[PDB]
Amino acid sequence: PIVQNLQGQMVHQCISPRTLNAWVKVVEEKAFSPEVIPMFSALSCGATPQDLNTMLNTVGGHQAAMQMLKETINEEAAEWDRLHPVHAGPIAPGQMREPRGSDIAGTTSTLQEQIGWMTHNPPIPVGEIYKRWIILGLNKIVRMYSPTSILDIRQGPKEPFRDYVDRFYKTLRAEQASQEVKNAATETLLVQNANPDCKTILKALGPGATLEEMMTACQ
Amino acid sequence: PIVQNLQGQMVHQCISPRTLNAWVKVVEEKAFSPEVIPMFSALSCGATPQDLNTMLNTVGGHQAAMQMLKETINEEAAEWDRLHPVHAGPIAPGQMREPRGSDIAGTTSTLQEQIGWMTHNPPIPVGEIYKRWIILGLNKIVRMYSPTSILDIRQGPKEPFRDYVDRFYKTLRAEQASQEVKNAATETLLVQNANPDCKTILKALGPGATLEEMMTACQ
Amino acid sequence: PIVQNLQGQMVHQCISPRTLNAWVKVVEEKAFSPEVIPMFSALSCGATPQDLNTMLNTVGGHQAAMQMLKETINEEAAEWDRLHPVHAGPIAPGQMREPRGSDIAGTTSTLQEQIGWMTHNPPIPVGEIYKRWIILGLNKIVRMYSPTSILDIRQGPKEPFRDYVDRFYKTLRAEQASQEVKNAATETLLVQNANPDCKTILKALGPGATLEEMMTACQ
Amino acid sequence: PIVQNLQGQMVHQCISPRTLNAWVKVVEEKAFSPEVIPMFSALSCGATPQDLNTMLNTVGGHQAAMQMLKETINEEAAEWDRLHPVHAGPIAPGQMREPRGSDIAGTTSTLQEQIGWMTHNPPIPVGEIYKRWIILGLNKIVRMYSPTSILDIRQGPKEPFRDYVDRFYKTLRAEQASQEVKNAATETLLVQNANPDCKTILKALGPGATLEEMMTACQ
Amino acid sequence: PIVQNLQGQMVHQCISPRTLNAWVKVVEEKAFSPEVIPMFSALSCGATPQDLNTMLNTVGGHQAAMQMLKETINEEAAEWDRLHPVHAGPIAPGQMREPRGSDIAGTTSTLQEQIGWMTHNPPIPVGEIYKRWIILGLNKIVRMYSPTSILDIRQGPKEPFRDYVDRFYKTLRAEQASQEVKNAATETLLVQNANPDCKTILKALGPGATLEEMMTACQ
Amino acid sequence: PIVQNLQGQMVHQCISPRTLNAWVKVVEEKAFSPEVIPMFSALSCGATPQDLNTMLNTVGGHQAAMQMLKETINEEAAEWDRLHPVHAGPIAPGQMREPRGSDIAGTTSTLQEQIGWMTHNPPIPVGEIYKRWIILGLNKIVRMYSPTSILDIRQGPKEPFRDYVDRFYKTLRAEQASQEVKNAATETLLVQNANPDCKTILKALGPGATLEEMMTACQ
Ligand SMILES: Cc1ccc(Cn2c(=O)c(=O)[nH]c3ccccc32)cc1
Ligand SMILES: Cc1ccc(Cn2c(=O)c(=O)[nH]c3ccccc32)cc1
Ligand SMILES: Cc1ccc(Cn2c(=O)c(=O)[nH]c3ccccc32)cc1
Ligand SMILES: Cc1ccc(Cn2c(=O)c(=O)[nH]c3ccccc32)cc1
Ligand SMILES: Cc1ccc(Cn2c(=O)c(=O)[nH]c3ccccc32)cc1
Ligand SMILES: Cc1ccc(Cn2c(=O)c(=O)[nH]c3ccccc32)cc1
């Protein structure tokens, strides 16, 4: 990654063993559960494109997912190239060349070039650009691997309401419902899919009930 | 987080793998037992709003709780906006814009803006403001998930007094009794809910007994 | 805590995840065995009052003990206030206010105030003052939770002498005998409570025997 | 390794215990699964040739592989010597000698010489040169230890499509198919080797289907 | 401990959680096996007397040993006081007082005084002095807890010679034989205590055999 | 060890708990398997003689090996003294004395002297000299503890060739065959000791086959 030292200049540091191991293990333990994404983003704070490739490449399973991710990355790279075409022909001696999609994705750029872009004034933030493409890809994967439709999350006759809501919102997160929909579901699908007893209590609370109020009601 | 380097300027550091892992694991092991809150506060020492979101987002279960927390955060954000309305229309070139509720909660502000606020002279402490909202939310959750009323904590006939008081005060903490009430209960509910034998000893000590004195008495 | 950076000024650092975890785990594993106290003292080296509260608050069990500790802290705070009354009425603009008991215990003071006191020239060492109160409290707890009187530590007929002395001194430590008494017991209670065979050997060594000499004798 | 200190000069640091242990353990757990290579590359970020030898030498098993790697390294060294012959006869007093193949591989050069080369202006990057030779060798090993031809990866009658694609791409990675071939296989061998039911669905999608589309289709 | 910062002045650092935990665990796992001593010495590199007390106090078992150690420390302290008597009466304002035995052992000196002594020019190395007393004490303990005389280490009829020599030298180390005796035993007791078969081979090698030669002979 | 700080001067640092623990554990787990040696060398990067003694002394078993190592060290020390005799009689006030063998081995020199030698301009590298003696000793031990002659490594009738070559080269490493012999064995003993079926294939490849070619052939 690129970090500020204790004196305030932006320099390259090696990715740490603790970072490498954290990411491998989270993938091992959680696969593409949705909370893996924010972990990825945090573990790659300051990453160069080289670093981002390192983290993805150190993953041993999930190779169907990694191939899908490559496809997504190529799509975004191709759109970058449409928006930001680069000059063919030789570089001005000693000067910074402009990055193409494949330079952002780290496949045609050197570590030195990446550093040069990211520490330019002002920065050409190739690490952040590539990270956004990667996350775009990873979210598609999360959605793909989500095993259950929200329509099939229904409260069991003996299932505590709390346990049911946990299942409901865990499913909506993986299915990647917007926050509008997450904020709205509380007045609709969450009640409809509740068991008869709690459905009756919830119906009676009336509209505009907070989730806290609904959960208290069905305790 | 924002830290002082070894030379005394306030700079942004990446959230560490050890921090990320600590929080995930405490949640995994303790859920919303009350001691989780002070751990959260300590693990997020110096956090930006981005960092606070990271820590909350890396939590994989408890999604009913995380939705309730969003609701709390929106409420506080809306109150911030009532108290501190911001100018519509374009920013003075190169100048710091004022933060709205959603900028404090990190949903409409960039990391760079957050840093700018938090390292201004004097600071607009957006990390601390958002942390307070989050903790407000988390305490509601603790109270919600508290499984037992203090009225149902009664000393067993063979239950050592110490074990009973531990249960009593653990329950009061989760139910979020004030310190007035915690300091007062020792002369009332704690005696009433004791077993017959210890109740008799405690009754005889007379009023004004310390908890240490009560515990010694029923040893 | 407050630390010296690599350049020699006194600055605030976040309490580390390793520190937080160390303390929680020592409490989990050892409860209020006496060696917990020196661990507490070492883990809170440089602590502000905020830090000390953090460490105590992160403890999930032992709530009877934590309530007793609050009582002790209030007692010491009240004695501080008797010895060092503070001016009512408004603070001199920009100047340091004097700390009350509850400011030392971190309940009415901000982190910024605490830092200001502790890094004043010369320091008002609020972290060390509060730590002493806490330890005073913790020692009471150790003594309370000590399960056995020294009078009931007697050497078994087949019990190796070494194992017996270990039990003896472990018990005296928890019961909080002075070092005078620890240094004296070797000529008295330790012999009296030994088994017949070793009692005879010890009696014959005569007075002024070191513990090393006594232990060699009964090997 | 050679690192930038907090002041911006290039200096030698000892290889860390965490690094040493990481590499030994990844080899212990994964042998020459393909994801071991990018881990090696990341764990040896900034390595001198001495460091690279350390990491290889600390491996206790896999000695057939380590012998094959020596052979590869000798081959590359011999090609370096063909391209970059060095002056026989004595060194200019106080001046930097040019590196031979065996100096790059760390077998005839001292740590001091290695440092001198790598921190020259401009650097003679002996660590990166040797790392490339090592990786060249390691990839041969991965391919050698790959247990299954891609022709034998066929979807089971009850095998979920996702699980089959994971097997397929894991195998192609170890067999070291190019990215052209990985990007192409999706329209050919992957369909042919699918089970009858999914083969029919895939055939009907038509050509130009993304892997995401294929995977959705056979869900 | 007292350390050199990154700028070259001698300053006080907090004892680390990793250090505290290392020592507790080595004692837990190895008790007073002889190799515990060099671990103690290394873990307390740079220690103040306060730090040394911390490490000893954090030990929960072995209280007979800790009492014996106190006795040893008092003996050395008393000898220090005989050799280096201090002026009674008040300290020169602002000046360094001379350390008594109990100031070296950290029982009558403050951390600030300890630091003042240890960073004086030239240093009064109170940490190293106290460490020597402690080690003197610990060696007595090792010897006390050594379970077997060297006279009872005899090679079994089916016991490999190597395993026998390991037992022999492990025992001599705990019994604290000098290096003269360790270097000499190879020509005497080690042969005498060997089994008949290896005794015959060893006898025939003749005098002046190295341990390597003896071990090869009885392989 | 002696390290470069973040400002570029050579200073003494305490050996870390992580280093101490790494070495003890590698010895516990691997004994004197050959890969232990390069681990030792790496873990003692920058070591003073004091540090080297620490690492050796913290080893609790293998005392026959540690005695043999002492003997080796005395031999090298005695040869140093033959080559580099030192002046008897008093040191020039304030000046650096020359190191004898026992000063290099850390038995008659102080830490301060060691530091003085190692940070002299130019350095008298006593840490590296002693490390070489130690490694010389350790290699003898590896060879001694090697359980099997290369003549007894023969391929089983159902033993995969790869598994056989691993056994072969693991044995040659412990027996400490030169690289000439390791590079040569592939055309001789490795074929002769192969099973009949693979022996026939190998014989037919003809001379000059790489190990990669041989291994492919017998797959
Ligand atoms: C066809 C294509 C698309 C995108 C990439 C980017 N990329 C790398 O360069 C790399 O080393 N590993 C990667 C792992 C997983 C996804 C993309 C990776 C490569 C090839
Ligand atoms: C409707 C609404 C309210 C509050 C927030 C703040 N927030 C984030 O921005 C985020 O990334 N994760 C969060 C996790 C748990 C609670 C609030 C989070 C978002 C949306
Ligand atoms: C009545 C009373 C007495 C003392 C304290 C001090 N104190 C805190 O402020 C805190 O946050 N946690 C604490 C945990 C355990 C003991 C005292 C704590 C609070 C209340
Ligand atoms: C014949 C030959 C070729 C290459 C090398 C390079 N090399 C080292 O120097 C070393 O110490 N360990 C190594 C481990 C595994 C591969 C090559 C190593 C040595 C000998
Ligand atoms: C009578 C006497 C002798 C020596 C000491 C020194 N000492 C401490 O001060 C301490 O806090 N813990 C200690 C643990 C184990 C041995 C000596 C310790 C105290 C008392
Ligand atoms: C007779 C003799 C030879 C060599 C040494 C060097 N040496 C130490 O000084 C030490 O403290 N531990 C050591 C452990 C294992 C080998 C040599 C050690 C001492 C004595």
Side-chain angles (χ1 to χ4, degrees), chain F residues 102-142 144-146:
Chain F
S102 68
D103 288 324
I104 288 163
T107 213
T108 56
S109 60
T110 67
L111 178 61
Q112 199 54 57
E113 289 174 328
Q114 290 166 23
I115 292 165
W117 293 313
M118 287 166 75
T119 64
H120 197 242
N121 196 343
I124 296 143
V126 295
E128 291 310 304
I129 300 162
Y130 184 34
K131 200 188 299 199
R132 180 184 326 127
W133 296 356
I134 287 161
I135 283 167
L136 191 158
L138 288 169
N139 286 335
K140 285 159 71 170
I141 293 162
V142 168
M144 189 132 301
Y145 291 10
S146 175

Side-chain angles (χ1 to χ4, degrees), chain C residues 179, chain E residues 53 56-57 66 69-70 73-74 105-107 130:
Chain C
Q179 195 64 47
Chain E
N53 285 331
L56 300 170
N57 291 341
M66 293 305 133
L69 182 57
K70 284 183 185 128
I73 286 166
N74 286 341
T107 213
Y130 184 34

Side-chain angles (χ1 to χ4, degrees), chain D residues 1-2 12 44 46-53 111 114-115 118 127 130:
Chain D
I2 309 283
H12 180 259
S44 73
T48 61
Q50 181 191 59
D51 288 336
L52 288 165
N53 285 331
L111 178 61
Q114 290 166 23
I115 292 165
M118 287 166 75
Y130 184 34

Side-chain angles (χ1 to χ4, degrees), chain F residues 1-5 8 10-70 72-86 88-90 92-142 144-157 159-179 181-182 184-219:
Chain F
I2 309 283
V3 301
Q4 268 208 62
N5 56 27
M10 285 315 264
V11 300
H12 180 259
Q13 290 202 336
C14 294
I15 181 160
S16 78
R18 280 206 51 101
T19 299
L20 292 160
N21 189 62
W23 172 239
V24 163
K25 294 317 181 179
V26 76
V27 179
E28 276 172 14
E29 284 153 28
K30 295 302 190 82
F32 298 96
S33 186
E35 69 280 10
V36 174
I37 304 340
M39 185 62 82
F40 178 76
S41 187
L43 288 174
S44 73
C45 176
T48 61
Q50 181 191 59
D51 288 336
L52 288 165
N53 285 331
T54 285
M55 283 174 85
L56 300 170
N57 291 341
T58 58
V59 176
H62 305 294
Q63 291 302 297
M66 293 305 133
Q67 179 74 20
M68 282 191 281
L69 182 57
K70 284 183 185 128
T72 298
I73 286 166
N74 286 341
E75 284 164 7
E76 294 308 307
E79 177 70 3
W80 179 268
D81 292 336
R82 195 183 67 70
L83 298 178
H84 301 107
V86 170
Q95 308 310 294
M96 168 161 301
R97 68 187 184 82
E98 302 193 291
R100 297 185 179 189
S102 68
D103 288 324
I104 288 163
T107 213
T108 56
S109 60
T110 67
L111 178 61
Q112 199 54 57
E113 289 174 328
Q114 290 166 23
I115 292 165
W117 293 313
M118 287 166 75
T119 64
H120 197 242
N121 196 343
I124 296 143
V126 295
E128 291 310 304
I129 300 162
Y130 184 34
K131 200 188 299 199
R132 180 184 326 127
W133 296 356
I134 287 161
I135 283 167
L136 191 158
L138 288 169
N139 286 335
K140 285 159 71 170
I141 293 162
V142 168
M144 189 132 301
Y145 291 10
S146 175
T148 300
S149 159
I150 193 64
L151 296 178
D152 296 321
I153 305 298
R154 295 175 58 234
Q155 182 187 13
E159 181 185 21
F161 193 68
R162 192 197 303 158
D163 297 342
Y164 156 71
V165 183
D166 272 351
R167 294 194 295 112
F168 192 94
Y169 289 96
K170 170 181 178 173
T171 295
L172 235 35
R173 191 186 186 177
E175 292 282 280
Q176 313 218 348
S178 65
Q179 195 64 47
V181 173
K182 290 176 156 175
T186 196
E187 302 263 324
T188 51
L189 192 69
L190 183 69
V191 181
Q192 187 74 299
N193 289 2
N195 74 25
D197 281 1
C198 165
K199 189 185 269 187
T200 301
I201 290 162
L202 296 169
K203 266 165 184 183
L205 286 183
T210 72
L211 172 63
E212 170 167 41
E213 277 165 0
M214 291 187 76
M215 289 185 78
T216 290
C218 297
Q219 205 134 44

Side-chain angles (χ1 to χ4, degrees), chain B residues 16-17 38 43 60 62 69-70 84 89 99 101 104 113-114 145 148 151 162 176 192 194 196 215:
Chain B
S16 78
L43 288 174
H62 305 294
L69 182 57
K70 284 183 185 128
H84 301 107
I104 288 163
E113 289 174 328
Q114 290 166 23
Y145 291 10
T148 300
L151 296 178
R162 192 197 303 158
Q176 313 218 348
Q192 187 74 299
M215 289 185 78

Side-chain angles (χ1 to χ4, degrees), chain C residues 21-39:
Chain C
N21 189 62
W23 172 239
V24 163
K25 294 317 181 179
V26 76
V27 179
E28 276 172 14
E29 284 153 28
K30 295 302 190 82
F32 298 96
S33 186
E35 69 280 10
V36 174
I37 304 340
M39 185 62 82

